[PDB]
């Protein structure tokens, strides 16, 4: 149940535990949706093969939710008379690891 | 369980402090000889605030002896802002740091 493909960014090493995933506001909207995610890390049941052997099949996961920035603050300061403050961003829509 | 106290108490909060920090959490009767035969002032005082303590209870807070001091403390406040020799020009006052005196008396 544990695979490791890689999206518009590695963000990988999963199977089912839906992994907070980088944005993608074009296919997402698709609530609990289905979509393909190229592989390149075939690790299943103690059997592996090139991430280049893979680059042929893959998987897919249901477009779950739209995590809302998990808090995180950025005190932008310095002795040099320069301050300011902006809170987290990076969310992301969640989605389970549809393995195959 | 019950308790004794008293503010507007002229004295070295500090000093005081050692006071209990001894007889502290311990058998009534027991320390009741600590402060009876210890030393430094406060004692006297300290003692006092143990009798209306042991009292209050049994009397209106009730089982004698089996008692003691689950806890005891003192706080400062009110000061006594005191004037002294004008820097031989400007004033220099100290402060007999008034003194509070609470202290528990609960039964074994």
């Amino acid at each position: 149940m544990f695979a490791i493909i890689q999206t518009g960014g590695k963000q990988y090493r999963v199977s089912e535990g839906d992994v907070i995933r980088v944005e993608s506001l074009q296919g997402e909207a698709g609530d609990k949706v289905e979509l393909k995610a190229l592989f390149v890390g075939g690790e299943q049941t103690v059997f592996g093969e090139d991430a280049g052997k893979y680059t042929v099949q893959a998987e897919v996961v249901e477009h779950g939710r739209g995590k809302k920035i998990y808090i995180r603050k950025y005190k932008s300061g310095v002795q040099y008379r320069r301050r300011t403050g902006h809170r987290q961003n990076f969310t992301a829509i969640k989605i389970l690891g549809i393995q195959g | 369980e019950a308790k004794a106290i008293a503010r507007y108490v002229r004295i070295s909060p500090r000093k005081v402090r050692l006071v209990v920090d001894l007889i502290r959490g311990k058998s009534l009767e027991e320390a009741r000889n600590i402060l009876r035969y210890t030393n430094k002032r406060g004692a006297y005082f300290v003692a006092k605030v143990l009798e209306s303590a042991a009292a209050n209870a049994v009397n209106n807070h009730d089982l004698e002896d089996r008692l003691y001091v689950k806890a005891a403390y003192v706080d400062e406040g009110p000061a006594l802002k005191r004037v002294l020799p004008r820097a031989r020009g400007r004033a220099d006052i100290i402060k007999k740091r008034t003194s509070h005196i609470t202290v528990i008396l609960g039964e074994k």
């Binding site: 490791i4 590695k10 280049g52 893979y54 002795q79 | -």
Partner: protein, 117 residues
């Protein structure tokens, strides 16, 4: 036209204060260096903000070595051989593997060594 700013400033401070965990003996409530100490901590975090992701670039670096060598070779070998790759190229996760799934790792480890020599 009274301005008893009052209630207001006080607040602000509270503000920061919060910004005020329970750090070092003092500042703790240090309605100043209180505030200060801040600015500091901040920017810090920042630079830390981008930092980390580095501290990693390396972390894996070793845990990596831990293996890359294990078998018998370094990360200027592997690497070279690796990029000899063609339909498979990654590094991060690689490590956290070699340790997670020995076989898996072990694997490539080969296909690799080879690619190379």
């Amino acid at each position: 036209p009274r301005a008893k700013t009052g209630i207001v400033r006080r607040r602000r401070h509270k503000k920061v204060l919060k910004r005020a965990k329970g750090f070092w003996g003092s500042r703790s409530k240090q309605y100043r260096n209180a505030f200060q100490t801040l600015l500091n901590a901040a920017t810090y975090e920042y630079r830390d903000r981008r930092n980390k992701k580095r501290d990693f670039r390396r972390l894996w670096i070793q845990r990596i070595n831990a293996g890359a060598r294990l078998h018998g070779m370094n990360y200027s070998t592997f690497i070279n051989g690796l990029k000899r790759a063609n339909i498979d190229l990654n590094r991060k996760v690689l490590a956290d593997i070699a340790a997670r799934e020995p076989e898996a790792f072990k694997a490539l480890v080969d296909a690799s060594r080879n690619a190379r020599q």
